[PDB]
């Protein structure tokens, strides 16, 4: 099941400011465990570092980006996340949020 978070890139290090109900269910984390943190806590031992750097660069480009990256639930179970990030702008054109949608595509 699919889920989504918003980060605030005007704060240092893109803390999560919104997390959909399904994110808590699918990952096992509580609201208090997620809000205010950077979403990289979903990565783990087998997460490919080149995909991590690819996400970092896509954010610096402020552009829509999708990548298949291995993530982990609170219980340690692993899943391929088809992660879809997109920028969200205010009416004046300023970057306001990143939205990032987690899509489990297979188990690991």
Q: Which does 92 bind (CB under 5 to 8 A by kind): a second copy, ligand FMN, none?
A: none
Return the residue of 54, 78, 96, 101 that touches a second copy, per CB under 8 A.
54
* Alpha-carbon distance values, 57 to 20, 50, 85 (Å): 25, 10, 12
Tokens standing for residue 29: 């984390």
Check whether 37 is labelled as a binding-site residue.
no
Cα end-to-end distance, the chain, whole Å: 15
Q: Is 65 in the site for a second copy (CB under 8 A)?
A: yes
Neighbours of 57 (CB within 10 A): 11
Residues forming contacts to a second copy in the complex (CB under 8 A) are 48, 50-51, 53-55, 57-58, 60-61, 63-69, 82
- Residue ranges at the known binding site for FMN: 38-40, 43, 56, 71, 81, 102
């Amino acid at each position: 099941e699919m889920s989504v978070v918003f980060s605030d890139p005007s704060q240092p290090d893109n803390p999560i400011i919104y997390v959909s109900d399904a994110f808590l269910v699918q990952t096992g984390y509580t609201l208090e465990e997620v809000l205010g943190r950077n979403c990289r806590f979903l990565q783990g031992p087998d997460t490919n570092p080149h995909a991590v750097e690819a996400i970092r660069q896509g954010l610096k480009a402020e552009t829509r980006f999708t990548i298949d990256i291995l993530n982990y639930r609170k219980d340690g179970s692993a899943f391929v996340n088809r992660l879809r990030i997109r920028p969200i702008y205010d009416p004046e054109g300023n970057l306001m949020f990143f939205a990032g949608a987690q899509n489990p595509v297979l188990e690991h």
